[PDB]
Design an enzyme around this catalytic site. Structure first.
Site, mmCIF file in Angstrom:
data_model
loop_
_atom_site.group_PDB
_atom_site.id
_atom_site.type_symbol
_atom_site.label_atom_id
_atom_site.label_comp_id
_atom_site.label_asym_id
_atom_site.label_seq_id
_atom_site.Cartn_x
_atom_site.Cartn_y
_atom_site.Cartn_z
ATOM 1 C CG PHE A 1 -2.081 0.965 1.082
ATOM 2 C CD1 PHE A 1 -3.096 0.722 0.172
ATOM 3 C CD2 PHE A 1 -2.154 2.101 1.873
ATOM 4 C CE1 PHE A 1 -4.162 1.593 0.052
ATOM 5 C CE2 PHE A 1 -3.215 2.977 1.755
ATOM 6 C CZ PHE A 1 -4.221 2.722 0.843
ATOM 7 C CG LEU B 1 -1.299 2.124 -4.849
ATOM 8 C CD1 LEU B 1 -1.014 2.110 -6.339
ATOM 9 C CD2 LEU B 1 -2.570 1.351 -4.533
ATOM 10 C CG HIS B 2 1.323 7.100 -0.455
ATOM 11 N ND1 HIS B 2 0.485 8.095 -0.878
ATOM 12 C CD2 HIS B 2 2.205 7.668 0.404
ATOM 13 C CE1 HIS B 2 0.842 9.239 -0.306
ATOM 14 N NE2 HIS B 2 1.874 9.005 0.473
ATOM 15 C CD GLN B 3 7.440 4.319 -3.250
ATOM 16 O OE1 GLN B 3 8.294 3.758 -3.940
ATOM 17 N NE2 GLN B 3 7.560 4.455 -1.932
ATOM 18 C CB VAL C 1 2.797 11.068 -4.514
ATOM 19 C CG1 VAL C 1 2.030 10.507 -3.330
ATOM 20 C CG2 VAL C 1 4.190 10.461 -4.590
#
Length: 167
Positions: A27, A30-32, A35
């Site tokens: 997760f 996926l976040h990076q 962004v």
RNA sequence: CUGCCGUAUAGGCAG
């Protein structure tokens, strides 16, 4: 509905790390990647979710258009995590399906600090890049509904008003 | 865990 594509990512079992930790890393990655992507048209869902045991399940589903999904997958954001992952094929979602929003949910001494100067839910355990503090990000899969509303998504893929097909 | 918005001590958010 423009987010008609998805990709399923399965956590491979690993005695060294429990699914929850593996999912958190996934997760966070996926976040990076989100962004870096910069948009707000990519959502997530956890299809194997166990609301009763507040467990996200072994699966992360990524929702997006064929093009947003394609761009997202072109990136080396799964570098050094692939061996821990099993990949479904990018696909057009089934139909019909209900829709629901997957959101971050938030709920004393901190509230006391800010004041002066003036959750039984599954979660991932993340890491604030700068502060280095680790925080729990609680996730709720909302009530199923017939159609999807207009709306976008956080850079964590969580609902900013948008819905994702549930199946 | 930490902060932000808000009279909130309601309700929202950010990592």
């Amino acid at each position: 509905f423009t987010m008609d594509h998805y990709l399923d990512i399965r956590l491979r079992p690993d005695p060294e790390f429990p699914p929850a930790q593996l999912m958190s890393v996934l997760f966070g990655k996926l976040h990076q990647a989100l962004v870096a992507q910069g948009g707000d048209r990519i959502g997530v869902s956890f299809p194997d979710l166990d609301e009763s045991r507040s467990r996200l399940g072994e699966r992360l589903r990524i929702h997006a258009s064929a093009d947003d999904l394609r761009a997202l997958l072109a990136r080396p954001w799964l570098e050094g995590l692939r061996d821990h992952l099993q990949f479904g094929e990018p696909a057009v979602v089934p139909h019909p399906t209900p829709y629901r929003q997957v959101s971050r949910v938030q709920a004393p001494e901190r509230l006391r600090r800010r004041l002066m100067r003036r959750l039984d839910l599954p979660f991932v355990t993340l890491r604030s890049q700068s502060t280095g503090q680790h925080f729990r990000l609680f996730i709720r899969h909302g009530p199923l509904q017939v159609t999807a509303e207009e709306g976008g998504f956080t850079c964590y893929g969580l609902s900013k008003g948008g819905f994702v097909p549930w199946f």
